[PDB]
């Protein structure tokens, strides 16, 4: 198991320049909680895409990136558990393997108006990208 | 007709793993994935894909096709005897295959294409479809299916054999197939009848129409169906393609047809919003109408907005394939290796269940075991009900991934350990 | 005849010395004898080697054909009729005798590599039938293993046993097969309520105990070979494995025609040190009705000595044929070794499934004996037996097996 | 009969450099007892290999050396009786004869973790090797 | 005299499974020529070990197996004459006698980098083993 990652604009683990770097070994669990209705009633709506390093640097996604998980409900604690095995019950396989890199980001505008804004968004403004270089 | 049919704990399935059927590759980069198994009249057909550093189906350089027999070894349990093992001549172009064991022989129905994304940007006239057939003595032979002389009940634009097995009825083969069509010709009374929270974006009629769309082609829809192939001893083929009933539609997904207990059972993997077991016996063939069960206890894990036990309509994609096998028609009993997890594909459990209650269950492994899909076939052996399941396992970390075969018996008495 | 527990039995034991040849070279070891008797005729086989008693390490292999003859002695005598050496002796891995239709038949496995069973396969080796009688010159025909059908994925095999059987036009020879995958179950072994070894579990212990001790990737499984033919023409060859009920590591066996039934014996070279034997119920799969013998065992060094019961990764044992005398009274005779770990003190033993009835030492002095074979038959309306013992009475000098003839006592306790 | 050899790391008969040499005549008995549960609870697990002089000197074994006897059970007094006759009930014959040499060693790590470690082990660390030159003196 | 055995990876007498078997009687000559510089200049470098059957199957040698003959020079035709007499001018005696087995192999990689490779090599890749039951 690993430390779950609360995915909100009010989370310190996202370094201002490097994002959130993780070095998970094979066979580890890792939760990615999208936040509940936060105390402050700031409805936080995101849409996460499994992406490649190049377009994660450019912070743009074409139609081919698959909507990994969407934080639709504000009240319900929607989540996304990860085990770094090869097989995943997700469309398009999403093989984790070993000695690879895995980047998770959101390009969305903070609210539901830009929920499906895929052009820019949080990927560069707040740099909320989870980068997982598995292995040493 | 003499086995445990009640709610009980600690069942004795007499579980044993079979390792000598599926080959073991010396190369660590090989992924053995997507196993299929169909048993009929004491003979079986096993299929799986081999790829290099990737476990994706069309991303496979070898596709193994195995034919074999059920044999008594005096062991008081059925044993798998591998008879023939061949590689597909067009393996590097295989998009999908479905096994059928007909008349004690193996038959493999495959779709071959230059484009692994052919289902998103092409049509079936641009692809080829083959039947590879063989037994214990004859060399395997592959014949091209004449899709030109095919009759269809609707304006389908594409199709692939997608499922865990097919069926032989007389001289006709009935293979599960997933079709692609680019116009909304469907109705959704069942989905539109749900009393769920209305999503702020779209209406329930829109939600239900769009949930049938391909997640990679907003203009295409994936509809399940069957293919009926009649022929005169591999001559003068007559091929028909019929779609599934519009009652309780679910997004196109690999299915199965099985001859069990004098009936024909259809299974459909739940890859959309209805995360509960889609299965039923076939009433009519045109349209392909399975009598859908009202099962309230069998589901499957998945990440995202539709995890295990999700019921409400939602534009979702993802899930796991988990065959079922009937044990008693009068008692409405079934067995299946399902995944005991809400979102992750892990912890396979042999589960004997009602339509309304789970009867008994047992984990396959004491340690956590990754399993993406399971298939199960049951049969009478020594006047007793026995079952064989195949799991696409990853017991070693990463590396050489390979499925596993397990054999077990339905408990004679309840609560024996 | 005597069917009760008694002491001082009168077997009227007599040794026969004129049958087995006497080699002039004192350094030569004559080892691994085999004997099969049928319808008053016998077939004797043994290996001859120089300063070594190993089977494949032999430069000569003797094949003898003979007849049972009455000499007016009120007891059977062995009459040696023909005696020839195998043309491929220096390449013989194993041979099994069968006396069919009053003639001798020898089924041998020949290979250039004495370790063929550890690193090769049966396509690389050859298998022959040598047959002859009292008048005809011996003829050797090659067995067409290419036209053989098998019930499983065997990678190698050798004729291994103390004798075979002739049924009509079919020969049934005991065989030890080789396979490179664990296709076996061990419900019988897994059922034992024994101390758990701290390293591995009982399912692992029982799986691994079927492996070859010299090739960790290989498994040795016993079975039979059925060879039917039209007067050495149009061979039909079938290879059937033994039942998975009460599996024991591959070992030399035997098939014998006795009392209207067919008896299979399997030497106990693993953890189950008690007598493995039984009459054949079905042929596919090869199912012998295993006996539940609690009194007959054999010596061996290591972790499985005499009377050892618990499953354990063991290898070793001695070959000790049995012969039934009366099936209804469940009586059997066998020359077993009365020692826990050493191969010595052979004793003719008439026994129950549950009790030893009576016994007699072969020699009053301590006698080294590595294996025994026994065959019984009706002679003068009485049950008589002939046994061959792989003896070493002259320690340091040459080794030569010994033949004994004896009668089942008519009355109990006569001396 | 001969004096049995208790096989434990606490046995003096194993000379620090020459091991334990024996000169038995043919027809002699000789037990090799692997020890019972010792007082101080130091569980001793070994696996003895009948070996050739070259690899007994190098203290390494390939797959062909036969596991002569293994000291599996810690409580049960496992043993190994030997008569120096020609015929022996062991797999691979093992004729003793006369005027020959017979070497017994173990490559095992002290505990069960390296029970089947065949590379080094006790053969060179403590030189627990039994060498048996049959003959008179 | 007997038919010499050319020792190169390009020799058919080495059966793909059985190696090369010879049944020589006592007092016969038998040369084992290690090859000259082949035409295409593929330098063939080997190191031959007189070995025992047990480690001949596993194709491994410890330090005690004696380097019977080494094929150092590529141009010079180095050779190895054998008479199956008892006495031989070789270190460690090498008594031939009769009715024995005698196995000769090389564990070497094709080139000089693995000349002294003793772990695997040609003994298992090409099964270039000479087995002599006299
Ligand atoms: C112990 O015994 C096993 C089986 O009895 C031996 O394993 C098998 O050995 C054979 C050769 O004797 C291998 O065959 C070769 O495999 C290569 C693989 O590419 C192939 O190219 C050759 O044409 C030939 O078929 C076989 O592969 C091997 N088993 C497996 C599963 O691969 C083993 O070598 C023996 N070991 C010892 C030390 O004796
Ligand atoms: C999604 O599916 C639609 C429906 O087929 C595709 O649109 C067709 O594309 C083909 C090939 O480019 C054209 O020949 C047709 O004229 C298009 N229209 C129709 C109605 O078929 C569309 O290209 C697909 N999206 C992709 C491939 O990204
Ligand atoms: C079995 O086959 C053998 C060999 O073919 C037969 O033996 C000979 O058959 C020829 C016929 O061409 C006769 O002329 C010879 O006299 C036969 N030899 C002997 C020694 O009789 C034999 O007849 C066949 N049938 C048997 C042995 O029953
Ligand atoms: C030794 O005990 C076993 C165990 O009961 C006997 O095996 C039975 O054999 C009969 C023969 O037809 C079968 O019908 C039974 O099914 C066997 N038992 C089981 C549990 O399956 C065996 O018969 C006994 N030995 C003898 C000589 O009778
Ligand atoms: C040997 O097995 C037989 C059965 O085949 C046992 O049979 C009887 O046991 C009673 C018990 O004392 C005796 O009185 C009888 O004489 C035995 N024989 C018969 C034909 O009934 C016999 O008990 C077993 N041997 C021993 C020593 O008990
Ligand atoms: C054992 O090895 C020898 C090595 O020469 C084999 O002898 C030759 O084998 C080939 C093909 O098998 C035959 O064409 C030759 O005729 C054989 N030599 C002679 C002199 O005839 C031999 O066959 C192998 N097997 C046996 C059983 O000897
Ligand atoms: C994000 O995009 C939407 C698209 O309509 C826009 O209305 C909104 O102002 C943008 N910025 C936000 C939500 O902060
Ligand atoms: C199976 O379902 C029926 C009703 O659908 C129920 O009465 C029965 O109790 C269930 N089976 C068990 C074992 O509870
Ligand atoms: C298979 O069996 C059925 C039995 O009805 C028969 O009609 C058919 O001709 C057989 N052969 C094939 C190739 O289906
Ligand atoms: C032996 O005799 C029987 C009948 O007398 C016959 O069927 C058989 O072919 C003969 N030969 C052999 C080898 O059994
Ligand atoms: C023996 O082998 C084990 C294997 O895990 C190792 O840990 C240990 O250090 C070795 N040596 C011992 C136990 O002296
Ligand atoms: C053989 O061994 C040498 C040892 O240095 C190695 O460099 C070489 O790659 C190996 N393989 C060959 C020469 O094919």
UniProtKB/Swiss-Prot annotation, chain E:
Mod. after translation: Inducible phosphorylation of tyrosine residues in the cytoplasmic domain.
Q: Which residues of the full protein are shown?
A: 31 to 164 of 346
Question: Which residues are sugar-modified?
Answer: 109
Localisation: Cell membrane; Membrane raft
List the ranges whose topology is Extracellular: 1-134
Induction comment: Up-regulated in response to TNF.
Q: What is this protein called?
A: Ephrin-B1
User: Hey, which family's this protein in?
Assistant: Belongs to the ephrin family.
Subunit: Interacts (via PDZ-binding motif) with GRIP1 and GRIP2 (via PDZ domain 6). Interacts with TLE1. The intracellular domain peptide interacts with ZHX2; the interaction enhances ZHX2 transcriptional repression activity.
Q: Where is the Ephrin RBD domain?
A: 1-134
Q: Which gene encodes it?
A: EFNB1
* Pathology linked to this chain's protein: Craniofrontonasal syndrome: X-linked inherited syndrome characterized by hypertelorism, coronal synostosis with brachycephaly, downslanting palpebral fissures, clefting of the nasal tip, joint anomalies, longitudinally grooved fingernails and other digital anomalies.
Source organism, top-level taxon: Eukaryota
Q: Tell me which tissues or organs this protein is expressed in.
A: Widely expressed. Detected in both neuronal and non-neuronal tissues. Seems to have particularly strong expression in retina, sciatic nerve, heart and spinal cord.
Q: What does this protein do?
A: Cell surface transmembrane ligand for Eph receptors, a family of receptor tyrosine kinases which are crucial for migration, repulsion and adhesion during neuronal, vascular and epithelial development. Binding to Eph receptors residing on adjacent cells leads to contact-dependent bidirectional signaling into neighboring cells. Shows high affinity for the receptor tyrosine kinase EPHB1/ELK. Can also bind EPHB2 and EPHB3. Binds to, and induces collapse of, commissural axons/growth cones in vitro. May play a role in constraining the orientation of longitudinally projecting axons.
Q: Which cysteines are joined by disulfide bonds?
A: 34-71, 59-123
């Amino acid at each position: 198991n690993l430390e779950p990652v609360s995915w909100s604009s009010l989370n310190p683990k996202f370094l201002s320049g490097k994002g959130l770097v993780i070095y998970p070994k094979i066979g580890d669990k890792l939760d990615i909680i999208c936040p509940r209705a936060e105390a402050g009633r700031p409805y936080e709506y995101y849409k996460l895409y499994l992406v490649r390093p190049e377009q994660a640097a450019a912070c743009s996604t074409v139609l081919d990136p698959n909507v990994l998980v969407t934080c639709n409900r504000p009240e319900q604690e929607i989540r996304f558990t990860i085990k770094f095995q090869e097989f995943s019950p997700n469309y398009m396989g999403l093989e984790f393997k070993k000695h690879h890199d895995y980047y998770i980001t959101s390009t969305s505008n903070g609210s539901l108006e830009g929920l499906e804004n895929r052009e820019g968004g949080v990927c560069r403004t707040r740099t909320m990208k989870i980068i997982m270089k598995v292995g040493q | 007709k003499i086995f445990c049919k009640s709610v009980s704990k600690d069942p004795d399935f007499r579980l044993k793993q079979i390792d000598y059927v599926i080959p073991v590759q010396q190369d660590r980069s090989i992924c053995m994935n997507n196993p299929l198994l169909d048993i009929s009249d004491g003979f079986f057909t096993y299929i799986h894909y081999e790829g290099i550093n990737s476990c994706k189906k069309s991303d496979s350089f070898k596709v193994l096709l195995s034919h074999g027999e059920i044999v008594d070894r005096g062991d008081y349990r059925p044993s798998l005897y591998l008879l023939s093992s061949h590689y597909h001549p067009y393996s590097m172009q295989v998009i999908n295959c479905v096994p059928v064991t007909c008349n004690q022989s193996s038959f493999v129905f495959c779709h071959i294409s230059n484009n692994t994304k052919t289902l998103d940007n092409s049509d079936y006239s641009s692809d080829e479809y083959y039947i590879t057939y063989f037994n214990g003595i004859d060399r395997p032979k592959t014949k091209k299916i004449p899709i030109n002389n095919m009759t269809a009940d609707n304006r389908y634009i594409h199709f692939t054999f997608s499922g865990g097995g097919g069926v032989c009825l007389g001289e006709e083969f009935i293979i599960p197939v997933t079709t692609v069509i680019n116009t909304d010709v469907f109705t959704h009374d069942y989905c539109e009848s749900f009393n769920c929270s209305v999503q702020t974006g779209k209406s329930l009629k829109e939600i239900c129409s769009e949930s049938l769309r391909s997640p990679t082609n907003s203009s295409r829809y994936n509809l399940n169906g069957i293919m009926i192939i009649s022929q005169n001893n591999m001559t003068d083929f007559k091929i028909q393609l019929n779609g599934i009933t519009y009652n309780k539609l679910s997004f196109g997904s690999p299915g199965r047809l099985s001859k069990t207990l004098g009936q024909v059972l259809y299974y459909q993997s739940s890859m959309s919003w209805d995360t509960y077991l889609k299965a039923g016996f076939v009433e009519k063939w045109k349209p392909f109408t399975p009598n859908w069960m009202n099962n309230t206890v069998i589901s499957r894990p998945n990440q995202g907005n539709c995890p295990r036990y999700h019921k409400c309509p939602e534009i979702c994609y993802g899930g796991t394939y988990n065959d079922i096998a009937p044990l008693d028609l009068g008692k409405d009993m079934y067995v299946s290796v399902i995944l005991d997890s809400d979102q992750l594909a892990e912890n396979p459990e042999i589960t004997v269940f009602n339509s309304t209650t789970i009867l008994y269950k047992e984990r396959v492994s004491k340690d956590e075991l990754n399993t993406r899909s399971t298939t199960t076939s049951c049969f009478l052996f020594l006047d007793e009900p026995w079952c064989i399941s195949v799991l696409e396992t990853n017991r070693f970390n990463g590396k050489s991934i390979r499925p596993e075969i397990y054999s077990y018996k339905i408990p004679k008495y309840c609560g024996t350990k």
